[PDB]
Amino acid sequence: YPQPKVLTPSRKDVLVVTPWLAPIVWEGTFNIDILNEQFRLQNTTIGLTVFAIKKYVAFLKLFLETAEKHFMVGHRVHYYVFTDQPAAVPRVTLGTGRQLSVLEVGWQDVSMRRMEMISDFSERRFLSEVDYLVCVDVDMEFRDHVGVEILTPLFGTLHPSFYGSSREAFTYERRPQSQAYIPKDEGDFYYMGAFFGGSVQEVQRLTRACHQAMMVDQANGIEAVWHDESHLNKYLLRHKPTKVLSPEYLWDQQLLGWPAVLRKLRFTAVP
């Protein structure tokens, strides 16, 4: 491998470590050959959850085809597709060591569905073999490597509309009557609900907390401004992630182009 050089920053343009010493994952910050060896030595298994409800089942074919090209290639992967149309999941051929299961799903209860269902699912014993869970939205495609550099006990992803913004511009929940409330003077980053994950335990804990917090808000007649994302951000403020993914990992090229600071566009919105 090329020797790291102590007197040469890996990036001169971006913050690559948070103030609580969690890596912010950008191209140029990691040697994937080292990371792949470390994770393969542990026989790492990654579960990928994705919800595809009503017309959004149409997005599963490109999402899965492109996951097979770019997501955790060479590691053990299990896809868990949550859908109300289990018979409509496309038959995509998978590489060795990779499996897919379909979990059938049965307005505020639809708002709670994602955290409720990931919470119930994440506690099942059929996950005993799975080491990390990654939770993403379906109306996306992979365009470049998304691999074991993201894995850690708890991660969030910088929202691509906000990574350049000050915190008062962040769209946190600002009513103190909501469990998701964040005061004006608080907050590290604005994380997006479309891509988070961690170890199975840390994802049990995040989704239980978000689900329980939303049920309290429902009981009180309150819907947070950005729904489970608002709760995700209150959670990650109090329980800080151990890696943060850069917007390479969650981007919309039609809306935001391809700025110089993004050396790769890895996981993008489908236009």
Added chain:
Amino acid sequence: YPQPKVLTPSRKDVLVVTPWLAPIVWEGTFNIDILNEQFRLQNTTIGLTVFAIKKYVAFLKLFLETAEKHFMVGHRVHYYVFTDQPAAVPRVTLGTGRQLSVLEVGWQDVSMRRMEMISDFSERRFLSEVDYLVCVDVDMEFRDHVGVEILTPLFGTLHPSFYGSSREAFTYERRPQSQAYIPKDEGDFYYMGAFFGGSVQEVQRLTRACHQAMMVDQANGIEAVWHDESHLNKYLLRHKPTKVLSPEYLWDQQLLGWPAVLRKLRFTAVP
């Protein structure tokens, strides 16, 4: 706290994350108030081990006085002083939540003593309450903050003579007959034996491995070039640390001055 800004590097002059995404700890990379809160919430206890043998017992008074000013202030600390002169340990008054124990010690077996004794010690049940062990040399003084930013499952410290050097200049053990052997083309950094640590488990594992490797070398009539440091470096090459401390943490101002890249000189040689 001041908002981290994604488009502003924390340092423009130094590498702050290794290629396996371990933070390299420099001033400017961490907000100590966040870290202190995270560690205090876990009631973190840090054990500090130090050997002071023969004439080196003279260095304990300034080492302890200055540890009390700068080492893990506000956290639970237990000092374990290994010495052949247990009656010569100075009576230094300690802050609340901090305790000191004296462990009496009884040429190649002196070379193995540090890893042998840390290994036996690290497995004792009187460490049940201790979360991290930090292992340093005694002929030093603290001059500035050394705190919970260093704590992680496994850490090493960049040797201050080598942080600017290419790997072929590193003084690894280069005879393939030694358990410490590192080939010319391998190596990430040169770590110093004077400051390493981690969680109690990871320090059990590092010191057991180094001790067992040195016993094999002794059986074969081989002493590695830099003794247990050579073994430390073979270990940290194969089991990569989860933080690396910058030379702020281990410096000699008489030999090396105070370069601009060191914003603080935290733990230094006594001239």
